[PDB]
């Protein structure tokens, strides 16, 4: 008889499945640890009216990107960048696009409109995002101003999760095997010493990020620039060891210009040598709130 064929099943379109053919590159946004992020328009109607999205893709780190995608898929918070979906062995992460970019780009261009009050509001928002991430049992491991996106003049969001790891249930930290290309000038002593990462290690990193925020991400006042002034620039493979000794002595990044001592004291609580002595994200939120109102 006639040719037999398969009954075509009822198909429901997945709003989180972006077709390669419609995902059109505009420009690069940034690079970060084996991945790169691009501005695209997803333009199924082919008329330049589709939504702008941030697309993360790789240049076996496919496995790491897959875990990152799955972490971000299940994070839902006002101060965490929004997952939109995937474009599919290979895969791309699709996220909302925030035109104002990172705090590293934004703050130097917007000093006049961002006063201390607004800086402290951003600080709270970063803390709420981090306290949410820690309540899901993750350590970020890459908290710096360059990874904080500007949604608006009034709102920031944590914008990349390239290094984010789960902490095991009933355990206090994650041991990092891979520690090359580590942001050492943002890292707590236990991270530099023993490759161990606690929620308190993220609190330390937040202190450094707060410093960046208060200096408006001035390149000449960067945590890297200031620490290398402290320890000596040209030491190469000995740099991290000299950094560790500096922190053991009790030395810390100085008070930002025009930063009130009361704000600096909150920052210093992020930088107690022992993780267990550091402030929490919630106590920081209470601290900033008190200085705001
Ligand atoms: C979070 C900042 C960042 C990190 C790594 C690569 C690129 C970027 N940049 C600069 C970026 C990311 C963005 C963005 C706007 N810029 N909008 C949504 N995302 C994920
Ligand atoms: Na899952
Ligand atoms: Na989500
Ligand atoms: Na733009």
* CA 215 from centroid of its chain's CA atoms: 18
Q: In angstroms, rounded to a whole number, what is the distance separating the alpha carbons of residues 47 and 115?
A: 41
Backbone angles phi, psi at 132, to 5 degrees: -60, -50
Task: Say whether 240 counts as a known binding-site residue.
Answer: no
* Best probe residue, ligand 1, of 40, 81, 159 (max atoms within 8 Å of C-beta): 159
Dihedral over Cα of 87, 91, 94, 99: its sign: negative
CA angle 78, 276, 129 (to 5 degrees): 5
Domain extents in the chain: 13-97, 98-293
CA nearest 116: which of 262, 5, 225, 251? Answer: 262
Q: What are the Cα distances from residue 3, in Å, to 6, 8?
A: 10, 15
CATH fold group of domain 98-293: Transferase(Phosphotransferase); domain 1 (1.10.510)
Q: Can you read off the two tokens belonging to residue 145?
A: 């101003």
Which residues approach ligand 1 with their CB closer than 6 A? 29-30, 32, 37, 54, 81, 95, 97-98, 101-102, 147, 149, 159-160
Q: In angstroms, rounded to a whole number, what is the distance separating the alpha carbons of residues 27 and 39?
A: 5
CATH fold group of domain 13-97: Phosphorylase Kinase; domain 1 (3.30.200)
Q: Which ligand is nearest to the CA of 161?
A: 1
SS (H, E, C) the chain: CCCCCCCCCCCCCCCCECCHHHEEEEEEEEEECCEEEEEEEECCCCCCCCEEEEEEEECCCHHHHHHHHHHHHCCCCCCECCEEEEECCCCEEEEECCCCCEHHHHHHHCHHHCCHHHHHHHHHHHHHHHHHHHHCCEECCCCCHHHEEEEECCEEEECCCCCCEECCCCCCCEECCCCCCCCHHHCCHHHHHHCEECHHHHHHHHHHHHHHHHCCCCHHHCHHHHHHHHHCCCCHHHHHHHHHHHHHCCCCCCCCCCCCHHHHHHHHHCCCCCHHHCCCHHHHHHHHHHHHC
What resolution in angstrom units was achieved for this structure?
1.8
Q: In angstroms, rounded to a whole number, what is the distance separating the alpha carbons of residues 200 and 271?
A: 9
Q: In angstroms, rounded to a whole number, what is the distance separating the alpha carbons of residues 46 and 172?
A: 50
CA of 85 to the centre of ligand 3 (A): 9
C-alpha dihedral over 150, 116, 162, 152, to 10 degrees?
-10
Q: Which of 131, 142, 160, 202 is catalytic?
A: 142
Give catalytic status of residue 170 as yes or no.
Answer: no
């Amino acid at each position: 008889g006639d040719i037999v064929s398969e009954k075509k099943p009822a198909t429901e379109v997945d709003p989180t499945h972006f077709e390669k053919r419609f995902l059109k590159r505009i420009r690069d946004l940034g690079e970060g640890h084996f991945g790169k992020v691009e501005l695209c328009r997803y333009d199924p109607e082919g008329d330049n009216t589709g939504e702008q999205v941030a697309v993360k893709s790789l240049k076996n780190h496919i496995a790491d990107l897959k875990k990152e995608i799955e972490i971000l898929r299940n994070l839902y918070h006002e101060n965490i960048v929004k997952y939109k979906g995937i474009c599919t062995n290979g895969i791309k992460l699709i996220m909302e696009f925030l035109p104002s970019g990172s705090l590293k780009e934004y703050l130097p261009k917007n000093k006049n409109k961002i006063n201390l009050k607004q800086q402290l509001k951003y600080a709270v928002q970063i803390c709420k995002g981090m306290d949410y991430l820690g309540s899901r049992q993750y350590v970020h491991r890459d908290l710096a101003a360059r990874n904080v996106l500007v949604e608006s003049e009034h709102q920031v969001k944590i914008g990349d999760f390239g290094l984010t790891k789960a902490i095991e249930t009933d355990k206090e930290y994650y041991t990092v095997k891979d520690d090359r290309d580590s942001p050492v000038f943002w890292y707590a002593p236990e991270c530099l010493m023993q490759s161990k990462f606690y929620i308190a290690s993220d609190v330390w990193s937040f202190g450094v990020t707060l410093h960046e925020l208060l200096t408006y991400c001035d390149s000449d006042s960067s945590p890297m620039a200031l620490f290398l002034k402290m320890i000596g620039p040209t030491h190469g493979q000995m740099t991290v060891t000299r950094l560790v000794n500096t922190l053991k002595e009790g030395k810390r990044l100085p008070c930002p210009p025009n930063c009130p001592d009361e704000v600096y004291q909150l920052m210093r609580k992020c930088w107690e040598f022992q993780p267990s002595n550091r402030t929490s994200f919630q106590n920081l939120i209470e601290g900033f709130e008190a200085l705001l109102k």
